[PDB]
Design a protein around this ligand. Sequence first.
Ligand SMILES: [Zn+2]
Length: 87
Amino acid sequence: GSSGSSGLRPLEFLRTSLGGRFLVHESFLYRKEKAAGEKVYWMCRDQARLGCRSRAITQGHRIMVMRSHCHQPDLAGLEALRQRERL
Ligand SMILES: [Zn+2]
């Protein structure tokens, strides 16, 4: 569990096989689309499956959300993706 109040909040990430690294935010999963040098654009990995166009921006140790999500988070599926990472 993670509970606390601070201006600069941390951020979680993930690493998958040939494809790049994932981003954990709002109990969801995103993929690094592009990088503006100092900024890194992401997109809900469920953009091809759940037709989710929800994008976000990561900077330093924080994160940002552009659009919303048309689907619900699956703590069950998200954890199954972290296991293959912590091993
Ligand atoms: Zn989404």
